[PDB]
Each structure stands twice: as structure tokens, then as C-alpha cells.
Design a protein around this ligand. Sequence first.
Ligand SMILES: OC[C@H]1O[C@@](CO)(O[C@H]2O[C@H](CO)[C@@H](O)[C@H](O)[C@H]2O)[C@@H](O)[C@@H]1O
Ligand SMILES: OC[C@H]1O[C@@](CO)(O[C@H]2O[C@H](CO)[C@@H](O)[C@H](O)[C@H]2O)[C@@H](O)[C@@H]1O
Ligand SMILES: OC[C@H]1O[C@@](CO)(O[C@H]2O[C@H](CO)[C@@H](O)[C@H](O)[C@H]2O)[C@@H](O)[C@@H]1O
Ligand SMILES: O=N[O-]
Ligand SMILES: O=N[O-]
Ligand SMILES: O=N[O-]
Ligand SMILES: O=N[O-]
Ligand SMILES: O=N[O-]
Ligand SMILES: O=N[O-]
Ligand SMILES: [Cu+2]
Ligand SMILES: [Cu+2]
Ligand SMILES: [Cu+2]
Ligand SMILES: [Cu+2]
Ligand SMILES: [Cu+2]
Ligand SMILES: [Cu+2]
Lengths: 334, 334, 334
Amino acid sequence: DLKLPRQKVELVAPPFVHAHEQATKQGPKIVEFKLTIEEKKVVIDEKGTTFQAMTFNGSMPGPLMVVHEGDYVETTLVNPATNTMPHNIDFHSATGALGGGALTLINPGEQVVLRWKATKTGVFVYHCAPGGPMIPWHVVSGMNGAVMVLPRDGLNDGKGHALKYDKVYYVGEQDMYVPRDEKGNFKSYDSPGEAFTDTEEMMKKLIPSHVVFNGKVGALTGKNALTANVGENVLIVHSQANRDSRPHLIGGHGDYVWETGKFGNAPEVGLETWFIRGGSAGAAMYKFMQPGIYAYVTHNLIEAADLCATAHFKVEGKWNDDLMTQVKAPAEIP
Amino acid sequence: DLKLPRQKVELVAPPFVHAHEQATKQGPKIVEFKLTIEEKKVVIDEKGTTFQAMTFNGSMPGPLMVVHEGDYVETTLVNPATNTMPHNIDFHSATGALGGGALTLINPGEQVVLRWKATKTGVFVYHCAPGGPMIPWHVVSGMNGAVMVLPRDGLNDGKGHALKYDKVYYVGEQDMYVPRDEKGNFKSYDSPGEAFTDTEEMMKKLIPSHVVFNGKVGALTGKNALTANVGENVLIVHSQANRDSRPHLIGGHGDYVWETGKFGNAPEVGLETWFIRGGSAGAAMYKFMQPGIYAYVTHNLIEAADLCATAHFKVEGKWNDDLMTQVKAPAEIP
Amino acid sequence: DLKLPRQKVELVAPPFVHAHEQATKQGPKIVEFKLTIEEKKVVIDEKGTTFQAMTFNGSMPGPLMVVHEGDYVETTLVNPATNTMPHNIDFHSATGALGGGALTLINPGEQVVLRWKATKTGVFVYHCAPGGPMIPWHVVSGMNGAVMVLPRDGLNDGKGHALKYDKVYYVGEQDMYVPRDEKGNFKSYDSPGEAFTDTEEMMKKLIPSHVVFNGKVGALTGKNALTANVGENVLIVHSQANRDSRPHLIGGHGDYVWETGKFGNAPEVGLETWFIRGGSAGAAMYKFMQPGIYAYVTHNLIEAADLCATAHFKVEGKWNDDLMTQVKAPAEIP
Ligand SMILES: OC[C@H]1O[C@@](CO)(O[C@H]2O[C@H](CO)[C@@H](O)[C@H](O)[C@H]2O)[C@@H](O)[C@@H]1O
Ligand SMILES: OC[C@H]1O[C@@](CO)(O[C@H]2O[C@H](CO)[C@@H](O)[C@H](O)[C@H]2O)[C@@H](O)[C@@H]1O
Ligand SMILES: OC[C@H]1O[C@@](CO)(O[C@H]2O[C@H](CO)[C@@H](O)[C@H](O)[C@H]2O)[C@@H](O)[C@@H]1O
Ligand SMILES: O=N[O-]
Ligand SMILES: O=N[O-]
Ligand SMILES: O=N[O-]
Ligand SMILES: O=N[O-]
Ligand SMILES: O=N[O-]
Ligand SMILES: O=N[O-]
Ligand SMILES: [Cu+2]
Ligand SMILES: [Cu+2]
Ligand SMILES: [Cu+2]
Ligand SMILES: [Cu+2]
Ligand SMILES: [Cu+2]
Ligand SMILES: [Cu+2]
């Protein structure tokens, strides 16, 4: 009965984002996505600690889905028979049925197709929510991502000026709860089900063992650093499905920030650190002015440095001595 | 010397709110309220855990008081001789004398009458604050509520359009600290005084055992679910006197949200999750678009599902397939 | 090559702030500051608990630096040979080189000179950040302060009206992590290096032992209470370099609040409690209406009353019975 054009999207793994238009002259379409659930044991730190992850499309976070206001989003959710648990999906961008969760519960071996109309602009969390105590456990096991609903005219500054980004990255932050044994070493488990009792006991004490970006300590460093050039406007979408975060670009700023993540509200300007409320996504754009390495962190510095929550940007371009200069290098005190 | 009309209010137990006007053609009045302190042992979970509660009017939270800007609020606070401790009241809406706390300290068997002028619009916490270490203990024992100070012209969207709610609910969130014994069972105590030493030790570690709405796990579920109909605009006032919270309406949104709770500021629009800073109240309105059950949670999902912080709404009306539809029910993967 | 006038500033210890102009007819200058690092064992509570502090200029927080938009800030950082560790400085107000940290690493016995252009208005954190796990440890050991970058026309309310303060105070909040021994007493250490292993273990559990203003429990009480008079407009700058805080003036309000701390954004009005995201500074102004004592707290009341985070204001002037009055003093219940 809904006769609009259909468009398929090939999702890509974070921190990258599938190709999309900002401002568009397309009218509404039915945009088709597929997410395939994977339960899998993964390594989350450089010491080799393992974790029983549950994921959309094999990644933590799940991929970023991008559509425009008034599009219809049609998702095929697939739970292969190689998984052990039921799963579903709740989109914070959607209206009704617990965000879709009440219409998408699937056992191993099943799939389901949900459509929702994108009536609210901004970045939004999506996550699994099977019911009861399973809800937090599936989310902190990795089953969360985000969807960005853009205005058809693209982003603006709330003073009538367009804000166009040159590139967008999605940084999904994950609080993880890995129990320890008596000697103080992290425990390993053979299945998500086996990890459940010890993991839930730890979860209810509210202190994570690890806080990571893109699923692992150091994920967004080295070869996999984020990149930019001086003069480039970069949008950083940040989500946290369970716990607060306080993003900060060390050596930069948030030139335009939607910390509650919703484009019907004007961005704030010139921030040092912003705040992502647990259960939400937010977005910050910054035009790089200096080359070199930047760190992108949550500014609980214990979490950033000691628990895993640090990404790098490597930026190319020319140094600006007007903005900053070492007037005198380190020398002996007179 | 203050010669204005007097109006008595019959307070009602949360989550309901006493009858009031939004926009009014009344001028300032002296609005009279009575709060009677009750110390009492209560059950806070479905397992039968008990808690030494201290309350205004017998409820957690204390009742919502509603007045208009420029009203004078005259409260009779009563501490019956059946209580064991001194108590007082601090209104965050009031100016001077520690919010009234320095003028309202009463021993068991006494009462006091305070008047304050409502010069600041918004929703505000009130709580007991006797002095020193007693302040946190009385607050986390349940001695907090809220007061809503409306503009005389009612609420607006900051773009000149009136925002009228069809009904208002008050959700008071309480962090509770119940100690455990060596075997890991929650302790019970014979008096608030006896619970104090163990409770304070736990409090200073900053991790609650329970986080509840309306005083108990499941308080706002089942027979006592919140209700609405499709097309109804519902205002949800949320307070947290000690600890942050991140409200979220699962399957809905915050169409207009004052997360810092103050009506001199325009509301933000279209939020997924909002943030109530500990020591504050905030308010969100939403027009329901779909029938069915919704959950209202703090979106630390461990707190919501495992520690008690989940309410339900049951909504009547017609399902809108344009907004959301199950295109294909759960079926075997091809 | 940069030929502007130079101006030296004599920094003062918090909570006071060096003399400055709000609105100025000066053009850009090179403003010169000196910070000398001191590592020292200090007492942080009235019980005599000691702490291995690391400080800029001997204080926690480091002093407030005040400049205007478009000034160049030239800091001489000095690490005397009496210290044991390398140090540096990161200014959140600056652009490039990790905020200056990549250009200012100095061993004991060295100094360095950094210049940065103040292109972003607001209050901003500065802190040490030597690298890796040292970053959180130096910050929570006390190595943080703030810098305020004012518009050249002074502050405004976002509706075209000037906001001029009669005085400004800087309240730096510090989360501290002091380990305990088996009997439950706080440990003392002979050097920062010796405190490191036990302190880091505690830090990673994310629960502070103390949360203080101006470096010690009770620092801003008694002889050292903050002061004002009825009718005075007071700006309170609040910073927290690692952990969130929720400031509240008990018996007052935030008449104009920049909770994200950035003057390119209009202030919010009439707040009860505001939120300082860890890694940021914010600012609130209030015109005092009533005399007497006020407490300024973080409104986690456990932190405020039990962990150290309470300051007082003593305010002189005439009581306003229109705003608040004790209609009937404490008396026996009829
Ligand atoms: O940035 C959103 C913010 O900007 C305003 C103008 O101040 O509206 C702009 O953005 C709207 C949403 O994209 C457009 O519909 C509108 O036409 C444009 O002026 C605000 O109303 C809004 O809060
Ligand atoms: O919603 C409050 C917000 O709206 C504005 C107009 O943008 O003012 C409106 O609300 C005020 C407080 O109720 C009214 O006094 C005013 O007349 C009305 O325009 C903003 O100034 C305010 O921040
Ligand atoms: O308070 C900042 C806020 O006010 C506005 C006007 O609404 O701009 C004012 O402040 C600017 C920064 O100081 C001035 O440049 C401007 O001239 C003045 O109108 C907003 O644009 C700004 O967000
Ligand atoms: O050895 N397990 O606690
Ligand atoms: O390196 N000494 O000046
Ligand atoms: O048995 N009490 O710890
Ligand atoms: O239920 N199987 O298609
Ligand atoms: O005695 N030290 O744990
Ligand atoms: O003090 N009794 O009224
Ligand atoms: Cu799942
Ligand atoms: Cu959710
Ligand atoms: Cu009390
Ligand atoms: Cu209070
Ligand atoms: Cu240092
Ligand atoms: Cu920093």
C-alpha cells in the first residue's frame, strides 16, 4: 500500500559511515537495511582479555544507518541458527511498540522485517531489548548502534547558515563488565549464557572493567587512527546506550555541538567537553586548524587512559604559529 | 500585613497531582499546604526487602505542590510525636534561609509555618536538610518531593505557541542504600536510628542497592501503570534529589523538554533521552501517537531493569501503520 | 615577529581571581603568566588525612587566568629541581599540540614558554597531561586549574543586555583517591611515586574517597567563607577536570548560568542546580537577595556533606520578609 521508491544501503563497519547525501532533492523513499546478529567471543584489550560479545553485523558498535526526515526505514533483522539467544531491535528514532522491540523478537533461525517512519531528526541509539534483565545484558554485551536522521536541507547553525561536513565518523562507546577470579585475573567463558551469572552480579555494582571505543582498547589508534586535514570540517557522532560519557577533542574543540543529538535544536558553539547521556547519541563538528595528533577521549581521564576510552586523529597540514607556538623550548631554569 | 486571598490545596499522593489551572486570570494568592512527616518501615521490592523510610505525607516522593509565579506558598510542616528525629524543609524554589531549612527545624511534637514567594518558574526539588551528615541520610531515606511554579499564562514553546498538557504525572526517583549482611542478604532494622551506621557506610561508597520510582520496584506497573490515549499531551515531571537520572520513554520521545526544569528557558525538542541532574527536577511533554505499552525508564538499563527504575504507560487508541508496521512477522530464514 | 604590547599578570590563589577588566577598550595584547609546579604532601581533612599533591603554583585548584578574546597568552611553566616527576600543561582554551601538552613537557630543573591565541570565549580547564596512565594520576593529584576568556564587550544575557559581575570567585572541585589499609585507615606515603601503585588501583574503581573545594574539607568555610552583600552580582566559576559535578547554591539560584561554560552561547536562566561535565568549567551568576549563610555544594549530598564538597557564603544586608518569612515559629502541635 506504501508506494514510494525503494533504495538499498550497503552498511559499512564503524567508525566509517555508508555513503549518503546531506542536503537532498530526493523526496521520501523506503530505505532498506539488513542487520545480521552475531554472538562471538572477542579480545577487548592488549593483554588478551576475552569477552562474550553480542553484536549487530559483527561490530561494536553496530553500523551507523543514515536517512532523511520523512524516509521510511525498512530493516531486515536476521538471527542465524548459529546464535543461542533470542534478540530484537529497539530504535529510539521510531514511534510505537517499544521502538520496534515488541515487533522484532526472533529466535535463532528466524528473521523479521520492520518499517518505521523517520519523523524526528538527529542521531539516535538503536539496541537489542529482549525483555527484563536481558535488556541491560544484551546492550552491555555490545548490541547497540545508532541511526542518523538528517533534515532534507542538511544541517544548519540555527542562525540560517548551512553546516556541511567533509566527513563523518561514528564513535560508539561501550561499557563492559568482565568479572575477575580470586587471584584478580579476568575470567573467560565458553558461551554468553555461561558468562551471564557472574556478569550480572558485576553489572549491578555499576562499575565497568573496560570502557572502549569501537569494541577494543586502542581500536581507533595506529593504523586505525581517524584522519583529517587542516581546513576539513569533521562530524563526530558519539553514542552510549547505557552510561554517560563526556567527549573531548584534546587540542581542539566542538565548534558546533548537539549534545542531546537532535537537529530540531540549534547547536551550541565553542565547547571544550560535551555530555552524552546514557541511552543517547550526540554529534559534534570541528574544523581542524592545526596538524598533528589529537586524542578524542571521554574526559573521565581514568576511563580514557586506564580503562580504554581513547581514539586518535592524525591530521595533515601546515602548522599555524599565530594560534600556538613554543616561544622557548625546554631549558634549564636560570 | 500581607493581605491577599488565601487558597487551601488538598495534596494528593504521587504520581497524581492536585487539581490546578495552567493559564490563570487569578492574581497572586497565598496558597496553603500542609505536610506531615512520617517515619516508617516499608517494603521496597518484590522479594520483601524492607527499608527505614522517612517521608513527607507518607509517600516517596512527597507530593507535588503546584502554584503560579508570584503566589505566596504557605506551608505548615508537622512533625508528630510518633517520629524519632528532628526534620525541616528546604525548597529549591525559595529565596533565603537555606531554602527555608534554617527556619523550619522541628522536633517530634512540633509544627512550623513558612511562607515564601514563588519568584522563579519551573519544577523544583524540596527536601529535608537538618544539618551535617543528616542531610544526605534524610534525603536518601525518602524525604524529598517537588514543587511546580507555572507562568500565569501557562507553558509555551519559546516561539510564541502555547503548550497545554492534558494531564501531568510526577515521577520521583529515589536512590536507596540498603546494607547486606555477610551471607549477602539485605539487612532489616528496627528504627531509622539503628539503620544509620550501616547505611552511612554504604552511602559513602556511592552505589545504590535500589533505584525506584514512587518508592518501590514496580510501583508504577500493573494496576498502577500510568495511562494515556492517543492524541493526549502528557507532562511528566521527574525529580531526583541526590543523584543523576536519564529519563527515556521507550517507544516515544520528549516532544518538548525542560531538562534543567526551568520555564524561563525554552524547551528543547524531539529528544530521545534527557538528563535530570541530581538535586533538580525536570519536565518533558509528549503527545502519544501509538497505543500499547510503553516503559518509562532511566536509561542506565542496569538501574532500570535490575535495580527498580521502570514505570509503564498503558495507552489506548488506534495503531498507526504509517508510523510503524511489521512488514513481515518472524519467520524461518530462507 | 608578534609585535603587540605585553602585560604581566600577578596570579592570586583561589578562590580569589587576579584583577581584570570585564569590558575593555584595550586591543589584543600578549598577557604573561608564570606557573611554578610544586609537589607536596598536604592535609585534606579535619581528621588529619594526608595526600601526595601535585600542583600549579602550590594550590588546588591552580589559579584562575583571565584574558580577553584575541589576546595571546604566554605562559612560563617552571618545574623546579626539587620535584621528582616530569610535568606539562594542556589548555582546553588553546588550539593544537594537545592543548600545549605536546610542547611543554619539562623535567625537574627545566622551564618552557608556550604562547596560544585566545580564539574561544568562556571558562576552560587547564591541566597536566604527561602521557599515558600518568595523565589521570597527575590530574587527580591536583594538577588542574582554569582560564577565563572574556568577550571584549564583557558578558551579555543573549538578549542584548550586559551582565556585569561585582565580584568573581573560582571554586575548583577535586576528586581524590586515598587508599585505605586493612584496618580501614587512610594510608600515608613518603612520595608521589610511592603512592602511585595503590592510588592507581583505587582510581580504576572510579569511587573517590574525598571530593573537596579549594583542596581540603572545609577550605571555603569559617574565616575563609566566601562573602557577598545583598544586591551584589557574584560570578562563580566552577571547574572539574576529571569527574562530573552538580553545583547548587542552597537558598539561592543561578540567575544566569553557562553550564558548558562557553560565552558564545546564551546563559540559561533561573536554575536550581547546574551540571559541570568532567573535563570542563562552567559559570553561574547570582544577585543576592537575602542576608545570612548560604552553602554552595555539589548536589550529590553524600559528596557534599560526607566527602567534603561544601563551601559557605556569608551575606550581609537586610532581610526581605516579602520573599520569605517564618509565619509561626516552632511550637507544640495543637
Ligand atoms: O538549528 C535548528 C534551529 O534553527 C532554527 C532557526 O533558529 O530553525 C532552522 O532550522 C529548522 C530545522 O532545520 C528549519 O526548519 C528552519 O526553517 C530553520 O530556520 C530554529 O527554529 C531551530 O530550533
Ligand atoms: O519559553 C521561554 C522562552 O520563550 C521566550 C520567547 O522566545 O519568551 C516567552 O516566554 C517568556 C516566559 O514565559 C514570556 O515572558 C515571553 O513573553 C515569551 O515570549 C524567551 O524569551 C524565553 O527564554
Ligand atoms: O549571549 C550570547 C548569545 O547572544 C547573541 C544574541 O542572542 O549574540 C550576542 O552575543 C554575541 C557574543 O558575545 C555578540 O557577538 C552578539 O553581537 C550579541 O548579539 C547570540 O548570537 C549568542 O549565542
Ligand atoms: O575463581 N573464581 O572466583
Ligand atoms: O638546556 N639548558 O638550558
Ligand atoms: O552480619 N552482618 O554483617
Ligand atoms: O515460520 N517459518 O517461516
Ligand atoms: O596494609 N595494607 O593494606
Ligand atoms: O511551644 N509550644 O507551643
Ligand atoms: Cu540481543
Ligand atoms: Cu533504549
Ligand atoms: Cu528529615
Ligand atoms: Cu537541596
Ligand atoms: Cu604533572
Ligand atoms: Cu583535558
